[PDB]
Every structure is written in structure tokens, then in C-alpha cells.
mmCIF file of N, CA and C in Angstrom:
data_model
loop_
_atom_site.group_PDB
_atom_site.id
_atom_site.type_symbol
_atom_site.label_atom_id
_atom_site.label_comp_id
_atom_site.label_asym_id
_atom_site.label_seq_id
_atom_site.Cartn_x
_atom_site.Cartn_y
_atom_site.Cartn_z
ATOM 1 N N UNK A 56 15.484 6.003 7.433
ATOM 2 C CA UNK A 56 15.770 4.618 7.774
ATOM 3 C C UNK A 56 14.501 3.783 7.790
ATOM 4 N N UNK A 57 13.235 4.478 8.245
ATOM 5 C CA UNK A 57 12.150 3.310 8.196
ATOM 6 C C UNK A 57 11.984 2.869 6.551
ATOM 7 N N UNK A 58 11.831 4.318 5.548
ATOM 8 C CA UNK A 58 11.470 3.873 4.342
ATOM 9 C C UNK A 58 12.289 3.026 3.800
ATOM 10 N N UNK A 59 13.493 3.372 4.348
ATOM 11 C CA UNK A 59 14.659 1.850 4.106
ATOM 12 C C UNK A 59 14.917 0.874 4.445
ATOM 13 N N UNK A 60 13.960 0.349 5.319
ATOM 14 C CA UNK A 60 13.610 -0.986 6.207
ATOM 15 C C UNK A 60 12.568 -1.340 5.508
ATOM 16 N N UNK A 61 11.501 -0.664 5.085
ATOM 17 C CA UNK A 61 10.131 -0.879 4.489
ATOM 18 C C UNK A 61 9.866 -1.418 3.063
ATOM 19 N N UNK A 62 11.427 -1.103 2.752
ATOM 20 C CA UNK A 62 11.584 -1.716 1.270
ATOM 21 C C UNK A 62 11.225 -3.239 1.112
ATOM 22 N N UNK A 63 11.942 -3.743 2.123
ATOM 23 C CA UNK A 63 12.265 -5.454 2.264
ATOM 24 C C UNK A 63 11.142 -6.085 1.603
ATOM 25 N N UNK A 64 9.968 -5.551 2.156
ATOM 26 C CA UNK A 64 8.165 -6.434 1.849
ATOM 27 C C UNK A 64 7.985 -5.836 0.567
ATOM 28 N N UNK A 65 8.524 -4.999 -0.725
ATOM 29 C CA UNK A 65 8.346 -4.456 -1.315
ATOM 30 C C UNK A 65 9.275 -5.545 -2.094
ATOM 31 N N UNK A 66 10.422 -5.652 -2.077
ATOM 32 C CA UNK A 66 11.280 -7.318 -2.552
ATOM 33 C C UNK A 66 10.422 -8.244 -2.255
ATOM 34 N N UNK A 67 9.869 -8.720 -1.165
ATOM 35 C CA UNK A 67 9.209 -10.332 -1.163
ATOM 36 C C UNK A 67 8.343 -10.160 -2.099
ATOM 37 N N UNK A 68 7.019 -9.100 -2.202
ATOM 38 C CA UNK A 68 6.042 -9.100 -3.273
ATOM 39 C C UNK A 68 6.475 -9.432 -4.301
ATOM 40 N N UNK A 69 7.785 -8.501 -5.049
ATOM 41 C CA UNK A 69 8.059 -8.706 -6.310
ATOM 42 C C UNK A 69 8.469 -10.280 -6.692
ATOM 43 N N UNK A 70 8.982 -10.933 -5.792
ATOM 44 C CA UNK A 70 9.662 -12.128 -5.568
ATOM 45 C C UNK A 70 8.161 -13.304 -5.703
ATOM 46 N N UNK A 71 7.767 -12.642 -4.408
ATOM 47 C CA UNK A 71 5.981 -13.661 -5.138
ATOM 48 C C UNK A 71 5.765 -13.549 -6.365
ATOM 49 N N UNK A 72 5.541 -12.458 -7.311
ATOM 50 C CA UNK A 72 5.099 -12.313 -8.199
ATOM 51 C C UNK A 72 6.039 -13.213 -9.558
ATOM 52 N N UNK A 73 7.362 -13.029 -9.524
ATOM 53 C CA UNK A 73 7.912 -13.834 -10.244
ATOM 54 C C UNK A 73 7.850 -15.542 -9.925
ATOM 55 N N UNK A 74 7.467 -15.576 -9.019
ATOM 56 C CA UNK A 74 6.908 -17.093 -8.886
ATOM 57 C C UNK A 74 5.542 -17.586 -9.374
ATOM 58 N N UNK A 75 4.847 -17.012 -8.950
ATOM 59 C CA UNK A 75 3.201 -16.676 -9.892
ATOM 60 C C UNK A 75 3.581 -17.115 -11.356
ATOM 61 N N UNK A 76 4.055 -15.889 -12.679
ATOM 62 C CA UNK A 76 4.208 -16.579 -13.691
ATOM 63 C C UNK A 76 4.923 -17.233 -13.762
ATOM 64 N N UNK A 77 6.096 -18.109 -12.780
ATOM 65 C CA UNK A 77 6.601 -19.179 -13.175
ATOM 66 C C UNK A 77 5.766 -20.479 -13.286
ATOM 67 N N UNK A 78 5.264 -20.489 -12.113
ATOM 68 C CA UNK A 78 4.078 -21.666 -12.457
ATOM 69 C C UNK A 78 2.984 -21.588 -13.370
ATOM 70 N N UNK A 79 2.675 -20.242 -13.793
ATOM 71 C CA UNK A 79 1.842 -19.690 -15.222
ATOM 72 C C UNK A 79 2.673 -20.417 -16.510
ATOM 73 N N UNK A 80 3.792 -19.940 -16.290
ATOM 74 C CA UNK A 80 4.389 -20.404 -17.512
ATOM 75 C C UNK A 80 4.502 -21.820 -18.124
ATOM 76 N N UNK A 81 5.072 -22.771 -16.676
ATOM 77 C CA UNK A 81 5.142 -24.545 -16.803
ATOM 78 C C UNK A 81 3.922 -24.596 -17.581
ATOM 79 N N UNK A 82 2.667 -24.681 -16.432
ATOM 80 C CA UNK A 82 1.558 -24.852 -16.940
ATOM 81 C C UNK A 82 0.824 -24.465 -19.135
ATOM 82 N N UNK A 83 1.474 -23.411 -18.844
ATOM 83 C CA UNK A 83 1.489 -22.622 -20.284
ATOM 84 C C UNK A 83 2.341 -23.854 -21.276
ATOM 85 N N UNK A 84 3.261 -24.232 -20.933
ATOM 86 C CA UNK A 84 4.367 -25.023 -21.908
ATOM 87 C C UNK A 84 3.373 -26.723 -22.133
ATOM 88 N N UNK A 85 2.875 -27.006 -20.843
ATOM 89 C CA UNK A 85 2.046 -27.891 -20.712
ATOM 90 C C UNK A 85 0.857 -27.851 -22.244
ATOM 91 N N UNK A 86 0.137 -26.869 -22.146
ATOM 92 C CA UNK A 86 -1.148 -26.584 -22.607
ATOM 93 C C UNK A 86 -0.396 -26.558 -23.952
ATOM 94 N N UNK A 87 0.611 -25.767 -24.571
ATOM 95 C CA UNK A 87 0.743 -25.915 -25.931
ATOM 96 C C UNK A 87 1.624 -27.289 -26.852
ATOM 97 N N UNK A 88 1.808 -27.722 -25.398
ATOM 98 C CA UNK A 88 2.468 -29.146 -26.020
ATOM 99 C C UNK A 88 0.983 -29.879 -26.388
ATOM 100 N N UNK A 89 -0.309 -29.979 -25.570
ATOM 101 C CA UNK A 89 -1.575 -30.292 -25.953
ATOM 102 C C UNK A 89 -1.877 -29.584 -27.193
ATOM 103 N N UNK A 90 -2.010 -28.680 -27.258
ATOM 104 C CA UNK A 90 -2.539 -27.954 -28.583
ATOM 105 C C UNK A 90 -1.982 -28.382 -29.708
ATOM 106 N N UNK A 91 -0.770 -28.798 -29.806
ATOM 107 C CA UNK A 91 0.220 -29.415 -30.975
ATOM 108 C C UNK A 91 -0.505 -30.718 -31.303
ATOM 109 N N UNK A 92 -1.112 -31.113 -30.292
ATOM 110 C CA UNK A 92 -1.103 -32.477 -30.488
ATOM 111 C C UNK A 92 -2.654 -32.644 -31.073
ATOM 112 N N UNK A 93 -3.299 -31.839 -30.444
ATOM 113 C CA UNK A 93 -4.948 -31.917 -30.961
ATOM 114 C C UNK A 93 -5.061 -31.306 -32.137
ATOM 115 N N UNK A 94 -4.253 -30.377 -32.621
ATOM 116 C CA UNK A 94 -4.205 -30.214 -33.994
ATOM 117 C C UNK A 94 -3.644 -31.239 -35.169
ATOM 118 N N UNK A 95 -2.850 -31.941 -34.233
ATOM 119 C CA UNK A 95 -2.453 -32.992 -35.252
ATOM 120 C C UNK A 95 -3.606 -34.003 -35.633
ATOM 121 N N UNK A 96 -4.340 -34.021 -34.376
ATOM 122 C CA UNK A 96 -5.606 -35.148 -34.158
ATOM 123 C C UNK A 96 -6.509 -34.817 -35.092
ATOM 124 N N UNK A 97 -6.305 -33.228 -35.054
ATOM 125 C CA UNK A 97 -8.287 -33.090 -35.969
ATOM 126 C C UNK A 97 -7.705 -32.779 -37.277
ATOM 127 N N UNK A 98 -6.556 -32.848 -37.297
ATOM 128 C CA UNK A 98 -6.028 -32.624 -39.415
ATOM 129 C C UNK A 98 -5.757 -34.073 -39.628
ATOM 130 N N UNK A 99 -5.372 -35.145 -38.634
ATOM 131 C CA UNK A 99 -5.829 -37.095 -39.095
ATOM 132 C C UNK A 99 -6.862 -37.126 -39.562
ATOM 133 N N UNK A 100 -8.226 -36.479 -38.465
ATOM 134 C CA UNK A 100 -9.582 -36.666 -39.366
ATOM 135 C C UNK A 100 -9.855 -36.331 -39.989
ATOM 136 N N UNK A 101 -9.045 -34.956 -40.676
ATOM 137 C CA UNK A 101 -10.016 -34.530 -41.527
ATOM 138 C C UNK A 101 -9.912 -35.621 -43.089
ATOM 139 N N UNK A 102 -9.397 -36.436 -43.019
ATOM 140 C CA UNK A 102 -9.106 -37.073 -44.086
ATOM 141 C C UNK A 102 -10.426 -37.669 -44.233
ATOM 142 N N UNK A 103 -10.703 -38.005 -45.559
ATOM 143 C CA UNK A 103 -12.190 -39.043 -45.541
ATOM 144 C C UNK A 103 -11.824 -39.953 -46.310
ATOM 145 N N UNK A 104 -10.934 -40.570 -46.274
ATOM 146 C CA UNK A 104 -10.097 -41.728 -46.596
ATOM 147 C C UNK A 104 -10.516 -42.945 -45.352
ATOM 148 N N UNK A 105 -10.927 -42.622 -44.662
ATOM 149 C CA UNK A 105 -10.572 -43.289 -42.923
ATOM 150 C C UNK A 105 -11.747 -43.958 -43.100
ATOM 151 N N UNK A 106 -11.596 -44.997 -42.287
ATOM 152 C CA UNK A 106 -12.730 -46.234 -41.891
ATOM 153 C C UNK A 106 -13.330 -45.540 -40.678
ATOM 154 N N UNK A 107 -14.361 -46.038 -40.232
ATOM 155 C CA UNK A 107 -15.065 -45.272 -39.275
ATOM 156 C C UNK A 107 -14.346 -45.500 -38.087
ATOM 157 N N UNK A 108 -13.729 -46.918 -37.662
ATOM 158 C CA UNK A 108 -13.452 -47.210 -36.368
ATOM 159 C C UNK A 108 -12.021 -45.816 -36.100
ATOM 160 N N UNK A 109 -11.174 -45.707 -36.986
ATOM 161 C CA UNK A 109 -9.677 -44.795 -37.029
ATOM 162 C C UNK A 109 -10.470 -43.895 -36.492
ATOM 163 N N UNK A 110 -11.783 -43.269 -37.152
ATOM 164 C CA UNK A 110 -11.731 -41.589 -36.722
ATOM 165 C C UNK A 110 -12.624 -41.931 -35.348
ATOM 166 N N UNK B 56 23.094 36.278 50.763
ATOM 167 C CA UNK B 56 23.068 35.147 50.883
ATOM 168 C C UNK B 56 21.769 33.981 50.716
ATOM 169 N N UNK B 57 21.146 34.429 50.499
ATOM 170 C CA UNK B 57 19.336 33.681 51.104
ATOM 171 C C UNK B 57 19.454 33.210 49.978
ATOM 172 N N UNK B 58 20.000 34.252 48.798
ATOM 173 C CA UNK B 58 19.275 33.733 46.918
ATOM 174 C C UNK B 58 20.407 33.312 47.167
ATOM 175 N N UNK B 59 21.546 33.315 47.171
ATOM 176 C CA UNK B 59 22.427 32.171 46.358
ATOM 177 C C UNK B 59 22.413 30.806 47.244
ATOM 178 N N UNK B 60 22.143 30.600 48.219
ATOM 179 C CA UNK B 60 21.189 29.543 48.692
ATOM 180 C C UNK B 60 20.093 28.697 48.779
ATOM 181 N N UNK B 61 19.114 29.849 47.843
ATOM 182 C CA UNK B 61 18.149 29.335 47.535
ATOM 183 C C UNK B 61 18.140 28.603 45.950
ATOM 184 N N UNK B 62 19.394 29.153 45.178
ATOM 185 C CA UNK B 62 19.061 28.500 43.873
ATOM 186 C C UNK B 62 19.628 26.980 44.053
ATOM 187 N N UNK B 63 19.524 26.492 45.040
ATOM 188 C CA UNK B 63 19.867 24.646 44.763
ATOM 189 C C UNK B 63 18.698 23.857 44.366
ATOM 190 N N UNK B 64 17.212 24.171 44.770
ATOM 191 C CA UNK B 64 15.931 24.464 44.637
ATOM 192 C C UNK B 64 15.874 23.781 43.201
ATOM 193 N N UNK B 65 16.251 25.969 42.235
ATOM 194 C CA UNK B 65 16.314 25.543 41.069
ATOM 195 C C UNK B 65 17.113 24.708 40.388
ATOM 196 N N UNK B 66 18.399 24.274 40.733
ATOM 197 C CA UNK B 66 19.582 22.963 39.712
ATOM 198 C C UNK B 66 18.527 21.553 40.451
ATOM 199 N N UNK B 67 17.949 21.435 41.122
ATOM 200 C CA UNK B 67 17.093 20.461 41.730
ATOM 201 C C UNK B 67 16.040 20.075 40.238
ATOM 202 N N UNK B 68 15.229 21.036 40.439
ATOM 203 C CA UNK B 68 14.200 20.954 39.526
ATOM 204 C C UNK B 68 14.988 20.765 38.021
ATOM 205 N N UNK B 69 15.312 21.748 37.734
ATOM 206 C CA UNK B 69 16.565 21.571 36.523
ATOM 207 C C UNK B 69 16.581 20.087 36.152
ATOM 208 N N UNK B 70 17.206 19.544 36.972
ATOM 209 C CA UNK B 70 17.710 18.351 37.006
ATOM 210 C C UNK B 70 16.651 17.264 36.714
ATOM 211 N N UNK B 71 15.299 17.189 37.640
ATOM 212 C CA UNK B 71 14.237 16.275 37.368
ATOM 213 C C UNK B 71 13.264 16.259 36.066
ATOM 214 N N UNK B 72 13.533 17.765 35.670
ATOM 215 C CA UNK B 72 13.181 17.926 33.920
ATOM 216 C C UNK B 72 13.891 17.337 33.157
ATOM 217 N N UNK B 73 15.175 17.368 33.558
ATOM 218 C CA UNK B 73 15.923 16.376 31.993
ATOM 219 C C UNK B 73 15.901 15.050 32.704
ATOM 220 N N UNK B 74 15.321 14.217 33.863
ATOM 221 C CA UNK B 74 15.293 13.165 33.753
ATOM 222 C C UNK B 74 13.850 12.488 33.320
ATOM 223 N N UNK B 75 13.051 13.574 33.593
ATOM 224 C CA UNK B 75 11.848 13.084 32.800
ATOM 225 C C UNK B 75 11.505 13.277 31.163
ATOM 226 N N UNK B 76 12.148 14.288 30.671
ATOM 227 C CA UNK B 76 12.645 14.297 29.771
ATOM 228 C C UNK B 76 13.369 12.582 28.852
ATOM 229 N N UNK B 77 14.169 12.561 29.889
ATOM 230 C CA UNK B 77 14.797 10.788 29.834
ATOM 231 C C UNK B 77 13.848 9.603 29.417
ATOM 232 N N UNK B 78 13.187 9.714 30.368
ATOM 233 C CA UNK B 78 12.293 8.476 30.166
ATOM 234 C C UNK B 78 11.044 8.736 28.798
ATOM 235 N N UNK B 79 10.768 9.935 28.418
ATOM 236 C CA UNK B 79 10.031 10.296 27.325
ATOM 237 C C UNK B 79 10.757 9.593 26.543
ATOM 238 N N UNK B 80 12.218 9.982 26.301
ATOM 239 C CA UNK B 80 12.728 9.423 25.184
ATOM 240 C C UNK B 80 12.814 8.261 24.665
ATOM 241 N N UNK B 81 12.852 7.372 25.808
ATOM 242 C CA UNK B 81 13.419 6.200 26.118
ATOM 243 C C UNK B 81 12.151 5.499 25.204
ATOM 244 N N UNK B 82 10.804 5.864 25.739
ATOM 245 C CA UNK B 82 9.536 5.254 25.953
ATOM 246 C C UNK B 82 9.322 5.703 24.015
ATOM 247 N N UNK B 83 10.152 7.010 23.332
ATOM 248 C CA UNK B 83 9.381 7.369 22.142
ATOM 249 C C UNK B 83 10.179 6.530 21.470
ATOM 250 N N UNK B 84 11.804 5.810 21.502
ATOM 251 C CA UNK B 84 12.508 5.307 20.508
ATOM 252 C C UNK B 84 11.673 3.851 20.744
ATOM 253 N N UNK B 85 11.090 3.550 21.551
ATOM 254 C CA UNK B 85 10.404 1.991 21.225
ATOM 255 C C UNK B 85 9.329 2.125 19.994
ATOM 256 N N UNK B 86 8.507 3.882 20.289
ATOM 257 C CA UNK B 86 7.234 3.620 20.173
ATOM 258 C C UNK B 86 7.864 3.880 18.482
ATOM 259 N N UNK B 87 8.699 4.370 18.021
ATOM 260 C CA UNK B 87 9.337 4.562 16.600
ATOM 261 C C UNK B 87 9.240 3.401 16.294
ATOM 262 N N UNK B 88 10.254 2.278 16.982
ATOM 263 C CA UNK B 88 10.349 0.995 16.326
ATOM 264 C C UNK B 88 9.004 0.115 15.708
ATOM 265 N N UNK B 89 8.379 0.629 17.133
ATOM 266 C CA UNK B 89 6.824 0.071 16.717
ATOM 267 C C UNK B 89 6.197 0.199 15.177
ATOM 268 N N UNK B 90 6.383 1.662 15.643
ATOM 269 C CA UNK B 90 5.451 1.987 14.258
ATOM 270 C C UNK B 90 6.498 1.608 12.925
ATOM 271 N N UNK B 91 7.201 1.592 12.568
ATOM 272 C CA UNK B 91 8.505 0.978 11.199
ATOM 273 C C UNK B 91 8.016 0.018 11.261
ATOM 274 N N UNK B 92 8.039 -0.921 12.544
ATOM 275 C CA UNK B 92 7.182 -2.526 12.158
ATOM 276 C C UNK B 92 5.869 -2.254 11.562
ATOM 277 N N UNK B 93 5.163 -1.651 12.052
ATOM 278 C CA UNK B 93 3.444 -1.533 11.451
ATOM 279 C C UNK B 93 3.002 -1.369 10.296
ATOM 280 N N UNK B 94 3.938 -0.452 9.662
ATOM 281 C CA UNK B 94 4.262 0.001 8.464
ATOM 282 C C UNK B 94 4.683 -0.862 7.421
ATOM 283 N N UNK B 95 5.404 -1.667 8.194
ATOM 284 C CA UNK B 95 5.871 -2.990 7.100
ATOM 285 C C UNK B 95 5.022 -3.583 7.208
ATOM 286 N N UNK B 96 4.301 -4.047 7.970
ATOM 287 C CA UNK B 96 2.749 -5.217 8.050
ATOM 288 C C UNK B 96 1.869 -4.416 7.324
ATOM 289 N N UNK B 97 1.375 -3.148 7.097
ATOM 290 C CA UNK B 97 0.412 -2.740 6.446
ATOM 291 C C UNK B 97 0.758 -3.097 5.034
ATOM 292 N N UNK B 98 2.471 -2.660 4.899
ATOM 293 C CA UNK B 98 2.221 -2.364 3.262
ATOM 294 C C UNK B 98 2.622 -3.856 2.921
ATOM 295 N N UNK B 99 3.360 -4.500 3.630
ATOM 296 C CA UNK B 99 2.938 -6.357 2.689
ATOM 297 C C UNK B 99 1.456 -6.762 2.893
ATOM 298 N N UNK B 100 0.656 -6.199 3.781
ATOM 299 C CA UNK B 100 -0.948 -6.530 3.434
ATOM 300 C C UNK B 100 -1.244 -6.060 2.543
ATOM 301 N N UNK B 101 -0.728 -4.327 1.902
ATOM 302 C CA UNK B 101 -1.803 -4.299 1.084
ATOM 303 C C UNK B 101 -1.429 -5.068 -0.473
ATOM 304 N N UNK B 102 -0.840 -6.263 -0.456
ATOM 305 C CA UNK B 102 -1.034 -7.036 -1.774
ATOM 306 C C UNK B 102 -1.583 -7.976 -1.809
ATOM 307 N N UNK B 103 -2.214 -8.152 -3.155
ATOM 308 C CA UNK B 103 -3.473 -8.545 -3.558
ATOM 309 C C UNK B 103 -3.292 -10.348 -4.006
ATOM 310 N N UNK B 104 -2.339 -10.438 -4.070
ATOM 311 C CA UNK B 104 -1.746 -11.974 -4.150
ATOM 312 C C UNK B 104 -1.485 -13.097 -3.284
ATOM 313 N N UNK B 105 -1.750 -12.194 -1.996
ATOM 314 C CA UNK B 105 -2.122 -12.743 -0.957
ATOM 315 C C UNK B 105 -3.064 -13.710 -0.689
ATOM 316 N N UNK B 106 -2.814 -14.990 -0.115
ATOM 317 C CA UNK B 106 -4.034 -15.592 0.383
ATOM 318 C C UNK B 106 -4.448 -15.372 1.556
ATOM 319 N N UNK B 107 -5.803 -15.842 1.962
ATOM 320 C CA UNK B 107 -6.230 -15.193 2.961
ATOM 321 C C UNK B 107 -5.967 -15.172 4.305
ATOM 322 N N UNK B 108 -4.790 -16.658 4.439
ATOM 323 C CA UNK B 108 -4.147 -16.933 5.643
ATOM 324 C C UNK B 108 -2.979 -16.022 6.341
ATOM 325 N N UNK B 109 -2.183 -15.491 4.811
ATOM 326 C CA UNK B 109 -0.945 -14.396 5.064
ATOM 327 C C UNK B 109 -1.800 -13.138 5.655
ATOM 328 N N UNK B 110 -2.337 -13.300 5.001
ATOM 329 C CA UNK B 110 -3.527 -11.740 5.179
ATOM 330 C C UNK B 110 -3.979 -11.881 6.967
#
């Protein structure tokens, strides 16, 4: 019965832990919506078509 | 007659062994509970995801 009471804190950890990469993850969805976008930025410049002020 | 008179003595004593007996018990089912609690505080301390306030 104790090792079966003792479980409980053995659930909350796991329970922390799936909260951990949840906020890993937002953050993660965050960062590659940026990355999409700065790649779009540095393949605009790479053009040498562009006036100085664009790039 | 003397001994079968004299054994009230022994159901006497008899008797104050299983009540001290009693109170051992009484005093070890707390000290059980105790320790099942302790056990659960050690092992949700020992994770590492902890900040230092839970801790």
C-alpha cells in the first residue's frame, strides 16, 4: 500500500513534464513561423535588381 | 491451594503485556503513516524540474 500511495508524485512529475514541452512546443511553432519569414527576407535580397533603399 | 491462588499474579501480568503491547502498536501505525508520507516528499524531491521554491 505505501508503494501504492507513492505512485501519485510519480503522476504529478510526469504531468509537469508534459507541460514543459508544451510550452517548448508554442514557443517552437513561434520560432519557425520566424524562420519562414527571414528566409523569405534574405531570398528578396538576394536579388541585385534592388535599389539600395529596398534592401 | 497457595498455587492456584497464586496464579492471579500471573493473568495480572499477562494482561499488562498485551496492554503495553497496545500502545506499541498504536504509537507504530502512526509512525508507518509517517514514514509513506516521507517517502512521497523524498521521491517528488528527487526531480530535477523542480524549482527551487518546490524543492
Amino acid at each position: 500500500s505505501a508503494t501504492a500511495n507513492s505512485m501519485n508524485a510519480v503522476k504529478d512529475s510526469l504531468q509537469r513534464g508534459q507541460s514543459t514541452i508544451d510550452v517548448a512546443l508554442a514557443a517552437g511553432d513561434t520560432i519557425t513561423d520566424l524562420l519562414g519569414k527571414m528566409k523569405e527576407k534574405a531570398l528578396a535580397a538576394s536579388d541585385t535588381s534592388l535599389n539600395t533603399a529596398s534592401f
